[PDB]
Amino acid sequence: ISPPPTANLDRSNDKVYENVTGLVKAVIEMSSKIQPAPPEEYVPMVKEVGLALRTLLATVDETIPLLPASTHREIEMAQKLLNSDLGELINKMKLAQQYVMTSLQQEYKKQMLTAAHALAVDAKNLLDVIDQARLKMLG
Amino acid sequence: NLDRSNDKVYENVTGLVKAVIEMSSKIQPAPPEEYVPMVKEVGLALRTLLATVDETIPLLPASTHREIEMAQKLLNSDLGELINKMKLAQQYVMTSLQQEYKKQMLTAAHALAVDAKNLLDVIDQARLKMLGQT
Amino acid sequence: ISPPPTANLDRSNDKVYENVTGLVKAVIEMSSKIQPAPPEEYVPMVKEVGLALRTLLATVDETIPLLPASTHREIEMAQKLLNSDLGELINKMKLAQQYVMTSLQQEYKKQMLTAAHALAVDAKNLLDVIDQARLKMLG
Amino acid sequence: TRELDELMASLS
Amino acid sequence: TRELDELMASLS
Amino acid sequence: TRELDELMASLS
């Protein structure tokens, strides 16, 4: 567990913060509507999660430059970690699709939830790293 | 506060200021054969700086973009005024007007440096707004 | 959560019980080993759990014929679940291989462990379904 | 992001 | 087992 | 900028 985002950084100009929020909300949305949802519904719910993550990654890309070169590696790693978390969510989603009409629809739906939850938690860990980085840069 | 370890903008501004400085401490005893190359360096340093700033703009708040673009314009202007005086200086080499022309040269070059420093200041403030300072 | 396998069935000749035990065990061999070892050593440690599951699946295939018709569905479903659990495990391996001597290498290993524990909890669930299946056929 | 878009193209 | 061998072949 | 200020100072 990590502490709430540091309070020593202004967040009105933080697009990383904003996109992490946007991503965690897309995850919260999907996991609140998923139990009774059919493939027509939850496939777009995951699409939205992906869009959210893509935006996030793009933004991180355009941030690394303003950050100490010594931090670019941990951030580049955090980014690859998220791409795979999305990868696992899509895997499980496809399985859920495949097994609609069967007992496994609900099992794989639980797995999508787990995947999505990992992605949200990791998006927040990315934020904590990038924040650690901004503070080194601000000295 | 800011870490300059890999601040190319800060590195180029420093280089432009050092160019304006070597030109200035060397101008009075110098012939046009020695000071034209000197202004040519100032120009290469300025071109290098503006290139860097051009690539940095995209990473800064659009709300800051125009103040930066103005500072950028101002600099090209100063090189303009500096190049001008340099030519006058060349024209009047060996004349009673040679000194007043190098003096205006120093004034143009100095202004260039002051204006590069202010650009560094504008750009630093835009990085602080991004990095999220309190 | 299920209660201990039912006592009301003789395990002397239960190859499913043996094969599940085998799979659970091959998983534990990777679960308690792997942390140390590099890719020249877990790539097979997986190939193992993969071979032990091939066997279990093979035996369940020879056992289904015999049970009530009605119950073949939950059991086929329980088997498909195990397949995808192995798929998870392999995806986490292929990744930890692509990220050797990194901060990520240790991550995709914790995920390998995760994915393998899943395979084990499910193998025990497979067994549970089939026991309900045999009990049905007996009463 | 090209591999990420192989994914983003998978949901159509 | 054909889908399981797709898997067993992945490990080479 | 303290070193760049040694410079800015050289021109007065």
From Swiss-Prot, chains A, C:
Modified residues (Phosphotyrosine): Y17
Chain positions found as Phosphothreonine: T6
Localization of this protein: Cell junction, Focal adhesion; Cell membrane; Cytoplasm, Perinuclear region; Cytoplasm, Cell cortex
Whole sequence portion shown: 909 to 1047 of 1052
Post-translational modification: Phosphorylated on tyrosine residues upon activation, e.g. upon integrin signaling. Sumoylated; this enhances autophosphorylation.
Disease: Aberrant PTK2/FAK1 expression may play a role in cancer cell proliferation, migration and invasion, in tumor formation and metastasis. PTK2/FAK1 overexpression is seen in many types of cancer.
Gene name in the database record: PTK2
Domain notes: The Pro-rich regions interact with the SH3 domain of CAS family members, such as BCAR1 and NEDD9, and with the GTPase activating protein ARHGAP26.
The protein's name in its UniProt record: Focal adhesion kinase 1
Modified residues (Phosphoserine): S2
Family: Belongs to the protein kinase superfamily. Tyr protein kinase family. FAK subfamily.
Free-text tissue specificity from the UniProt record: Detected in B and T-lymphocytes. Isoform 1 and isoform 6 are detected in lung fibroblasts (at protein level). Ubiquitous. Expressed in epithelial cells (at protein level).
Complexes and interactors: Interacts (via first Pro-rich region) with CAS family members (via SH3 domain), including BCAR1, BCAR3, and CASS4. Interacts with NEDD9 (via SH3 domain). Interacts with GIT1. Interacts with SORBS1. Interacts with ARHGEF28. Interacts with SHB. Part of a complex composed of THSD1, PTK2/FAK1, TLN1 and VCL. Interacts with PXN and TLN1. Interacts with STAT1. Interacts with DCC. Interacts with WASL. Interacts with ARHGEF7. Interacts with GRB2 and GRB7. Component of a complex that contains at least FER, CTTN and PTK2/FAK1. Interacts with BMX. Interacts with TGFB1I1. Interacts with STEAP4.
Function text: Non-receptor protein-tyrosine kinase that plays an essential role in regulating cell migration, adhesion, spreading, reorganization of the actin cytoskeleton, formation and disassembly of focal adhesions and cell protrusions, cell cycle progression, cell proliferation and apoptosis. Required for early embryonic development and placenta development. Required for embryonic angiogenesis, normal cardiomyocyte migration and proliferation, and normal heart development.
Annotated segments matching region Interaction with ARHGEF28: 4-139
